[PDB]
Design a protein around this ligand. Sequence first.
Ligand SMILES: CN(C)C(=O)COc1ccc2ccccc2c1
Ligand code: NA
Lengths: 302, 302
Amino acid sequence: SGFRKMAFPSGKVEGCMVQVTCGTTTLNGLWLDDVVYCPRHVICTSEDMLNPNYEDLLIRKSNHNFLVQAGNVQLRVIGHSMQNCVLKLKVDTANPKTPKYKFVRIQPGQTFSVLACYNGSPSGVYQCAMRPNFTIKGSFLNGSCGSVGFNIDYDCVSFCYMHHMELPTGVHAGTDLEGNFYGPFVDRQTAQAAGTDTTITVNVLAWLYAAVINGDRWFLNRFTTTLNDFNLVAMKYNYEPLTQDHVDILGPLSAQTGIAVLDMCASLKELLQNGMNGRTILGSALLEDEFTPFDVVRQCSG
Amino acid sequence: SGFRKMAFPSGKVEGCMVQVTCGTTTLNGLWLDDVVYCPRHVICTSEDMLNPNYEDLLIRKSNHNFLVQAGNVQLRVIGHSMQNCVLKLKVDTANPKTPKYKFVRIQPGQTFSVLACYNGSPSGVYQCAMRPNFTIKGSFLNGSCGSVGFNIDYDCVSFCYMHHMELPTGVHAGTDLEGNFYGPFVDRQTAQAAGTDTTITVNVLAWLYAAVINGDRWFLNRFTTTLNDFNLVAMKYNYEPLTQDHVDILGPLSAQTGIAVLDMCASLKELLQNGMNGRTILGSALLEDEFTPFDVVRQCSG
Ligand SMILES: CN(C)C(=O)COc1ccc2ccccc2c1
Ligand code: NA
């Protein structure tokens, strides 16, 4: 029993974190096979943050301008190339700890673990979700750029996020490992703000099913709803639209608990209207939206 | 910026988890140097567990009755002995991935990371506090016994917890690595219950300090107080008494924010007596007590 926001074991990723230095700037890179991936803004100076021309900055660098340190071992850079917003540094040693891996670009609502690192050394691991406004509510201090987000499936690590920057509201923006940013953000220090965030409705529903599986039923009611009526209500609380795809995805949890998806939708409507009345659900006084339907089944059934 | 419940990187511990099977029972072991540590109740059948005589059941087993698998290899057991409630299995090969480590017993209110495992396979990591009633609020399914808790202090892993059982309210109980239970529990299938719990006051204060550092300031007020008057409020609201030691431990945070500890206790007094007025703190509608002062400093300054 019990329900916790758990992260993936970080060891497979720890063996890949290195430190990348360029000029006075030091941040983290991900060392896989003979390539080190890091954010391209490592090549920016004080004067470059607003309108950097990365092609012009990069053409002026030699391999020996990039210092890559893996533990106490300096790695030799033998080539470099830019792919969108990530730098790919060719190094002369393949990482012997390279796990089974792939790169996947995730969708809003998807969860993953972050290994926060500073100077190539991991600091901590926690679990995150890609918010509907394509930011993450992470925990990052200065020097954390290049920390990565990932899932693990059996022995394969799916890298999905690289941290680039913190926006003014304290949330965080970054790229997939092909260097494409999530959302409308760019690696410039000009004014950009995350769109209004919303609650990930399909995740809240999955988490209500988790509460039921763990033996808590107090929030159910005798009502049902149509999908359109649910969305008309939920949008008034800044909840994401619930689609037929989301209804299909919740099917397995519906079958396991005996509660139809639209019946759980009706319970969620009443919860938004009533609040908790001093109670909790799985130990929270708020509705939790950073567990996916997949996560819930995985943590409850194994 | 940002504040997340953060576990230590788990890689050093993943390299020590093995699968231990005795009879029909499979659970997890901790392989350090040439010893595997696991709960002694692995030798019990379901009827044995009703009233086990462990030294007697242990005499009846031999080395070959313990199958130990490190991933894909079977370790050969060459000796066995009990220390309190943990079984020590001497094996033929020392673990090459043994980290620098010590066995330490933690105090209630202290936190640690839990690496939840199944069939010797690490599956999830999360952060836990030792509750004042000596339980932890974990997430464990069948087969998680032998999962371990730990902290890391400058490349040294301090092992502090081994999981043994779930209580009827769904919280969990276990031992230190020397086999001594945390709390008034026994490894027997008898009627056991968690005692009435209390809230870890010094941790709530630490978390209020973390919120101020992150820009959440609405609960600060003009008032201050004394330990004696505050502890009157603490006792009334089922909070652990604040000692003079707690105030000193909070000293560094009280200086980095400019908010004195008893200045902050006045904010907490007001929150206990009046509630949160529909507001949240660091995205929580409850007062969080599973962050220690050290946890806040390491994440928000370190
Ligand atoms: C979202 N997140 C971190 C995960 O799903 C972790 O991965 C696993 C893998 C196997 C499990 C077996 C039993 C219980 C939980 C499990 C979790
Ligand atoms: Na005050």
